[PDB]
Amino acid sequence: MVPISPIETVPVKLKPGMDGPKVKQWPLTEEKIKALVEICTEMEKEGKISKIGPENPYNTPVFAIWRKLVDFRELNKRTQDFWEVQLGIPHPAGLKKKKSVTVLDVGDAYFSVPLDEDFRKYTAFTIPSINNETPGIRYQYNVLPQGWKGSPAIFQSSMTKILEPFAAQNPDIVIYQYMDDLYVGSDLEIGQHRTKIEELRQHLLRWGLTTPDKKHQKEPPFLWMGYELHPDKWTVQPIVLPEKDSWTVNDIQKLVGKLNWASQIYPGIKVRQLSKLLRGTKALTEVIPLTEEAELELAENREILKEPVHGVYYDPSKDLIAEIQKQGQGQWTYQIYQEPFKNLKTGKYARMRGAHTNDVKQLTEAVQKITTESIVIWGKTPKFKLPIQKETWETWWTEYWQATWIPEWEFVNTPPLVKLWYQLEKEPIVGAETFYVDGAANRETKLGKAGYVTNKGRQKVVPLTNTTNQKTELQAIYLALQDSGLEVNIVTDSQYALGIIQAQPDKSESELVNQIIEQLIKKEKVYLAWVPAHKGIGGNEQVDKLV
């Protein structure tokens, strides 16, 4: 016999202060018991388990469906935490084309990885005897049990340690491990590739691990995690939008799932309205009528999802490019590619929940997201194509009160273009009228007043019902914008209104703020000055609006 190299065991402990499992065995039928006695006899003959005496106080229930299934949920609750086998799943767009990709089944290596001997006593299980007239058969696991908490991590780390020298001494190939399957790709000639595959089978056999000489079942196109992987391209598994006369909540969640999933390769997918219908529902069986905007959006989705679209694989020798388009209502779409017309992947970005916003902030956020995703997938930041003029961005970031930055980018003339809709002046305007505004409300009756007085003697006070102080302050500014010329100075005491306008929004939840924005767009020059209230600053007439 050729000596088999031993696989180093991983020291495993339980959670601190806890004890091993002690669960009552399920009573089983005579046929199930016989089947489990046969299966466990074979496994004991193979070395996966071993008989134990009565000194072992721990027990884990066993089942059969034969097939033996051990319910390790309690031992999983009591087992230590392990380092995650995978922090995330790879993305197909990050893969690199290979001339040959072979799949090796290392499933027989799963039960060949030994378990820490001091931990085996916690895997004890009992087969009930026939009619329970004898003591049940006591077994314990000598290898990693399927279903135990630490089996995938210990298995993957052991396989990694085994594969390390082979991968090191063969840099001209690529080895990946996923569950009980290995994937070996290379650009070598097919003969050399099969040769190095045989070399890998031998190297794995030096640990007693057997790879089947049988032709593997997996073959192109690989269907994996909702993906189709082809020799030269990748895509998502076929997305079919069903034809429904009426749509419930689970139909809309399945449709937004198919659309979110399809958005990574199909450009232009929008999910704003369909997901908007699911706002604050929390009822799975509730039928919700479909808005017209959801109908137009769904029709555009069916038009985009008409024919199949594929993504290419990553070529590290070419540059990485990400182009962004605005779609309206806080929706953005982007394509990541290296050659024109051939996308690596696509995606979308929806604006965050906010009371006020502008297009430039949303574009900045989208760029940050794309940067993070690209570093995840390809390890580098892509060069951007953005629908915004260089001068627009320069004005924005130079005048913005926050610090901001986007990486290397170039302007692409793809409307709608992100633009600055208004810019406040830095100094007062000579020759322009000066509107001193103010507003006030009663906290009980919700009655208020908003108005202004100007340096030319122009005045206005308007009474308002069902309003607040903040509302009357905004309303006062709005009145000043309404009744002034193209250039106007505005003096307020509202730190609230100044806080809103200095954030430079172009859209808002409040219709009043949107009206103020629409007024600011029409102006040529607007200077907004702030003063402390109730300090006797004339012109600023608090008494005129508190009547």
Partner 1 sequence: IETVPVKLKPGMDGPKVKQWPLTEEKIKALVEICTEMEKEGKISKIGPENPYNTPVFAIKKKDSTKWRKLVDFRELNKRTQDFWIPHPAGLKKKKSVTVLDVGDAYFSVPLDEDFRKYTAFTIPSINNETPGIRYQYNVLPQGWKGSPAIFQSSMTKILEPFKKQNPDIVIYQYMDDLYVGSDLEIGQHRTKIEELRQHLLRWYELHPDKWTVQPIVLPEKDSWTVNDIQKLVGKLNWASQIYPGIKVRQLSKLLRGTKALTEVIPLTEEAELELAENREILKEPVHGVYYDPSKDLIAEIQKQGQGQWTYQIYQEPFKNLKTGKYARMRGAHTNDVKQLTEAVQKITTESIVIWGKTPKFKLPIQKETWETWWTEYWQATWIPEWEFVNTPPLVKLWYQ
Ligand X SMILES: Cc1c(Oc2ccccc2OCCn2ccc(=O)[nH]c2=O)cc(N(C)C(=O)CF)c2ccc(C#N)cc12
Nearest-Å Rg of the Cα atoms of the chain is 34
310 forms part of the interface with ligand X (CB under 6 A): no
Only one of the segments 97-105, 136-144, 466-474, 520-528 lies at the binding site for ligand X (rule: CB under 6 A); that segment is 97-105
321 SS3 class: strand
Q: Which does 491 bind (CB under 5 to 8 A by kind): ligand X, partner 1, none?
A: partner 1
97 forms part of the interface with ligand X (CB under 6 A): yes
- Closest to partner 1 by CB, 45 or 534: 534
Closest CA to 128 of 18, 24, 45: 24
Q: Which DSSP state fits 448? A: E
353 forms part of the interface with partner 1 (CB under 8 A): no
Q: Which does 160 bind (CB under 5 to 8 A by kind): ligand X, partner 1, none?
A: partner 1
| HEC assignment per residue over 136-184 | CEEEEECECCCCCCCHHHHHHHHHHHHHHHHHHHCCCCEEEEECCEEEE
Q: Which does 498 bind (CB under 5 to 8 A by kind): partner 1, ligand X, none?
A: partner 1
Only one of the segments 202-210, 246-254, 274-282, 451-459 lies at the binding site for partner 1 (rule: CB under 8 A); that segment is 451-459
How far is 66 from 42, CA to CA, in rounded Å? 13
Q: Which does 241 bind (CB under 5 to 8 A by kind): partner 1, ligand X, none?
A: none
Binding test (CB under 6 A) with ligand X, winner from 59, 126, 177, 358: 177
End-to-end CA distance of the chain: 105
Only one of the segments 186-194, 301-309, 479-487, 524-532 lies at the binding site for partner 1 (rule: CB under 8 A); that segment is 524-532
Q: Is 31 annotated as a binding residue?
A: no
Q: Is 81 annotated as a binding residue?
A: no
Binding test (CB under 8 A) with partner 1, winner from 123, 142, 364, 467: 364
Q: Is 493 annotated as a binding residue?
A: yes
Q: Which DSSP state fits 503? A: T
Only one of the segments 102-110, 218-226, 272-280, 370-378 lies at the binding site for partner 1 (rule: CB under 8 A); that segment is 370-378
Each residue of 107-134: b (16+ CB within 10 Å) or e? eebbbbbbbeeebbebbbbbbbeeeeee
- Closest to ligand X by CB, 60 or 177: 177
State in angstroms the smallest separation of the CB of 499 from partner 1: 6
Joined together, the tokens standing for residue 396 give 């924005």
454 forms part of the interface with partner 1 (CB under 8 A): yes
Q: Which DSSP state fits 336? A: E
Please give the residues from 91 up to 130 whose contact with partner 1 meets the rule CB under 8 A.
91, 94-95
Please give the residues from 181 up to 200 whose contact with ligand X meets the rule CB under 6 A.
183, 185
State in angstroms the smallest separation of the CB of 188 from ligand X: 12
Joined together, the tokens standing for residue 357 give 């916003």
Binding test (CB under 8 A) with partner 1, winner from 57, 308, 416, 532: 532
- Closest to partner 1 by CB, 325 or 364: 364
Q: Which does 185 bind (CB under 5 to 8 A by kind): partner 1, ligand X, none?
A: ligand X
Tell me whether residue 307 is exposed, middle or buried, using C-beta atoms within 10 angstroms of its C-beta: 0 to 12, 13 to 18, 19 or more.
exposed
447 SS3 class: strand
Binding test (CB under 6 A) with ligand X, winner from 35, 37, 153, 174: 174
Please give the residues from 218 up to 277 whose contact with ligand X meets the rule CB under 6 A.
218, 220, 222, 224, 229-231
How far is 475 from 472, CA to CA, in rounded Å? 5
Cβ atoms of 146 and 82 within 8 Å: the answer is no
- Tell me which residue has its CB nearest to ligand X: 185
178 forms part of the interface with ligand X (CB under 6 A): yes
User: What letter represents residue 371's amino acid?
Assistant: T
**Count of residues in contact with ligand X, rule CB under 6 A:** 20
Please give the residues from 51 up to 90 whose contact with ligand X meets the rule CB under 6 A.
90
Q: Which does 282 bind (CB under 5 to 8 A by kind): ligand X, partner 1, none?
A: none
Joined together, the tokens standing for residue 23 give 């669960």
- Match 């509730």 to its residue by tokens: 286
Q: Which DSSP state fits 14? A: B
Q: Is 438 annotated as a binding residue?
A: yes
195 forms part of the interface with partner 1 (CB under 8 A): no
496 forms part of the interface with ligand X (CB under 6 A): no
383 SS3 class: strand
167 forms part of the interface with ligand X (CB under 6 A): no
- Closest to ligand X by CB, 91 or 120: 91
How far is 495 from 292, CA to CA, in rounded Å? 40
The DSSP-derived string for 42-104 is HHHHHTSEEE--TT---BB-EEE---EEE--HHHHHHBPP---S-SS---GGG----SEEEEE
How far is 325 from 327, CA to CA, in rounded Å? 6
- Match 């906010």 to its residue by tokens: 354
Give the binding site for ligand X (CB under 6 A): 90, 95-98, 101, 174, 176-178, 183, 185, 218, 220, 222, 224, 229-231, 313
The annotation places the binding site for Mg(2+) at 105, 180-181, 438, 473, 493, 544
